[PDB]
């Protein structure tokens, strides 16, 4: 039940996979921003 | 900078789906150039199948399903014994102006 | 019911000029924008120009500026005009809506046919 694409180099831009990171959202704070 | 083509070929026996694939001359295709899908009855009769690279238009049935499948245009439909014996034009919005593709003939069975 | 419909006489000889015009229904020219596509005998079918839903217009950059398209608010009527034909220049003419405010953004309705052939 398994099914493996082959990559390789010569695999074009669209059959060679593009590597996806998908972020999910108190800790993790944004930087605040400060003056003089 | 204006090539559009399809494969002008398809022939799906039922039950099995299949993609066409239209391709442009910028490579692969972003929605930010909007990919439009149409079929063509054998009387001049024309329908809207796909519409902004990922919708289905309003009114066609969800057996029609168009997305960016590979890195080009391209359109899935799910055999049909019947209904599906048309020709399919694939549209690319250009800065300026709209390009319509030069369809593609299905016969199924 | 939304429809389209697009009416004239469509037998032209060459050199003279002829115009089509296209009638609507269901929908207004506010909400929605009309596009032109035309059907040589045989071939593929080609973008003609395009109408603004609030005024401007835009033509095929090919095509020549010598031809206009002419549109109706109040009653609900476009015309579009050829002012000298060309014997390359038989085709099938078709109107078509477009609703770039919609979210089907892409042209939703097209026009029902006109023949148009030289001699």
């Known amino acids: 039940p398994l099914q493996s694409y082959g990559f390789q180099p010569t695999n074009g831009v669209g059959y060679q996979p593009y590597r996806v990171v998908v972020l999910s959202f108190a800790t993790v704070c944004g930087p605040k921003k400060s003056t003089n | 900078q204006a090539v559009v083509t399809q494969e002008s070929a398809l022939t799906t026996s039922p039950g099995e789906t299949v993609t066409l694939t239209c391709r442009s001359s910028?490579?692969?295709?972003?929605?930010?150039?909007?990919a439009n899908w149409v079929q063509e009855k054998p009387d001049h009769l024309f329908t809207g199948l796909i519409g902004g690279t990922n919708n289905r238009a309003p009114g066609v049935p969800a057996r029609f399903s168009g997305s960016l499948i590979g890195d080009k245009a391209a359109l899935t439909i799910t055999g049909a014994q019947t209904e599906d014996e048309a020709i399919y034009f694939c549209a690319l919005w250009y800065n300026n102006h709209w390009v319509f593709g030069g369809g593609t003939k299905l016969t199924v069975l | 019911q939304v429809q389209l419909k697009q009416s004239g006489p469509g037998l032209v000889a060459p050199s003279q000029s002829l115009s089509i015009t296209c009638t609507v229904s269901?929908?207004?020219?506010?909400?929605?924008?009309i596009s032109w596509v035309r059907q040589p005998p045989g071939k593929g079918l080609e973008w003609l120009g395009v109408?603004?839903?609030?005024?401007?217009?835009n033509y095929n950059s090919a095509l020549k500026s010598r031809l206009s398209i002419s549109k109706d608010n109040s009653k609900s009527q476009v015309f579009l005009k050829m002012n000298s034909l060309q014997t390359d220049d038989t085709a099938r003419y078709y109107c078509?809506?477009?609703?770039?405010?919609?979210?089907?953004?892409?042209?939703?309705?097209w026009g029902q046919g006109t023949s148009v052939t030289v001699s």
């Open positions: 269901g929908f207004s020219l506010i909400n929605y924008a």
């Open positions: 910028t490579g692969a295709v972003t929605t930010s150039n909007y």
């Open positions: 078509a809506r477009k609703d770039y405010y919609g979210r089907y953004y892409g042209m939703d309705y």
């Open positions: 109408i603004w839903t609030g005024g401007g217009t």
